[PDB]
Design an enzyme around this catalytic site. Structure first.
Site, PDB file in Angstrom:
ATOM      1  N   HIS C  29       0.803  -1.233   0.000  1.00  0.00           N
ATOM      2  CA  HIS C  29       0.000   0.000   0.000  1.00  0.00           C
ATOM      3  C   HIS C  29       0.838   1.287   0.000  1.00  0.00           C
ATOM      4  O   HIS C  29       0.308   2.363  -0.283  1.00  0.00           O
ATOM      5  CB  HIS C  29      -0.950  -0.031   1.200  1.00  0.00           C
ATOM      6  CG  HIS C  29      -0.217   0.094   2.503  1.00  0.00           C
ATOM      7  ND1 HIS C  29       0.570  -0.899   3.085  1.00  0.00           N
ATOM      8  CD2 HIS C  29      -0.121   1.234   3.238  1.00  0.00           C
ATOM      9  CE1 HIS C  29       1.105  -0.333   4.179  1.00  0.00           C
ATOM     10  NE2 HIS C  29       0.714   0.947   4.287  1.00  0.00           N
ATOM     11  N   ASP C  51      -1.105  -7.696   1.837  1.00  0.00           N
ATOM     12  CA  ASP C  51      -0.661  -6.313   1.601  1.00  0.00           C
ATOM     13  C   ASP C  51       0.866  -6.182   1.493  1.00  0.00           C
ATOM     14  O   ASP C  51       1.480  -5.299   2.089  1.00  0.00           O
ATOM     15  CB  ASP C  51      -1.307  -5.344   2.602  1.00  0.00           C
ATOM     16  CG  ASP C  51      -2.832  -5.402   2.540  1.00  0.00           C
ATOM     17  OD1 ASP C  51      -3.394  -5.131   1.455  1.00  0.00           O
ATOM     18  OD2 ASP C  51      -3.469  -5.721   3.570  1.00  0.00           O
ATOM     19  N   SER C 103       4.725   2.652   8.662  1.00  0.00           N
ATOM     20  CA  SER C 103       4.511   1.275   8.184  1.00  0.00           C
ATOM     21  C   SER C 103       5.768   0.612   7.595  1.00  0.00           C
ATOM     22  O   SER C 103       6.648   1.273   7.050  1.00  0.00           O
ATOM     23  CB  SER C 103       3.392   1.271   7.151  1.00  0.00           C
ATOM     24  OG  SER C 103       2.958  -0.038   6.876  1.00  0.00           O
TER      25      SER C 103
END
Lengths: 52, 48, 151
Positions: C29, C51, C103
């Site tokens: 992402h 992901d 992240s």
């Protein structure tokens, strides 16, 4: 007409017994902490996707 | 012509069974590829 | 214990990527591409189930990669913002340690090897829940609680 009323209510009470069976099968797993339910039973009792 | 006309795309001969031999090939290759996709999809949902 | 190796995306606060075992791993992402050109030119595999994205580490730099384990006992763990914990079958932090832009950070055990990667979370002060990827026996998996968002 009376044959339709009995036959359409026989599939009705089959759906009612299927509902009555599902709630008594699934509530033990629902009413327990920690997301416990197994894979095979999740498909059989049509509880959307996975054990979440 | 003393007979009526043919179905032309319909009522093809006996020994057109080539159509069924190839359709029972290619259509089962489709059925097996969909079976393979369904069983890997099924275990990929066991992998949630 | 700062014995860690990583890379960032587009040279900005755009999340992170890890060297683990013999393969690069990265979130799907995050925008842009890897900062280091000797990694960035490689061919990457991906999966929306996790992901996630991955590539093989070049052999000259494979020696620089971090170690890993499948183990997840209850207790306390190491990562760049500290205070990370595993309990009740969940990874958790206090809120201040995790937010958007952070992240792709790896979580390490008490012996200095990676157990999981931070993708995102669902906020609360004392125990924020996390969306993460981790390995079970020898297969990768995604863990995600109710109501999380990716960072």
């Amino acid at each position: 007409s009376v044959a339709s009323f009995v036959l359409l209510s026989m599939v009705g009470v089959a759906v009612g017994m299927c509902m009555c069976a599902r709630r008594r099968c699934i509530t033990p797993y629902e009413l327990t902490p920690g997301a416990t339910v197994p894979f095979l039973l999740s498909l059989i009792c049509c509880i959307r996707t996975a054990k979440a | 012509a003393s007979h009526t006309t043919l179905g032309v795309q319909d009522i093809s001969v006996t020994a057109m069974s080539w159509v069924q031999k190839i359709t029972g090939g290619v259509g089962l290759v489709v059925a097996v590829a969909a079976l393979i996709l369904i069983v890997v999809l099924c275990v990929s949902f066991s992998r949630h | 214990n700062d014995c860690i190796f990583e890379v960032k995306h587009e040279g900005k606060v755009t999340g992170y990527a890890c060297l683990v075992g013999d393969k690069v791993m990265k979130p799907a992402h995050v925008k842009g591409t890897i900062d280091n050109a000797d990694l960035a030119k490689l061919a990457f595999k991906r999966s929306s189930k996790y992901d996630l994205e991955c590539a093989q580490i070049p052999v000259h730099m494979k020696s620089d990669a971090s170690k890993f384990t499948h183990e997840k006992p209850e207790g306390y763990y190491n990562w760049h913002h500290g205070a990370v914990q595993y309990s009740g079958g969940r990874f958790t932090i206090p809120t201040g340690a995790g937010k958007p832009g952070d992240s792709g950070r790896p979580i390490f055990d008490n012996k200095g090897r990676v157990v999981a990667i931070v993708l995102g979370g669902a906020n609360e002060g004392a125990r924020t829940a996390l969306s993460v990827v981790t390995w079970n026996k020898d297969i990768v998996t995604k863990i995600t609680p109710e109501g999380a968002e990716e960072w």
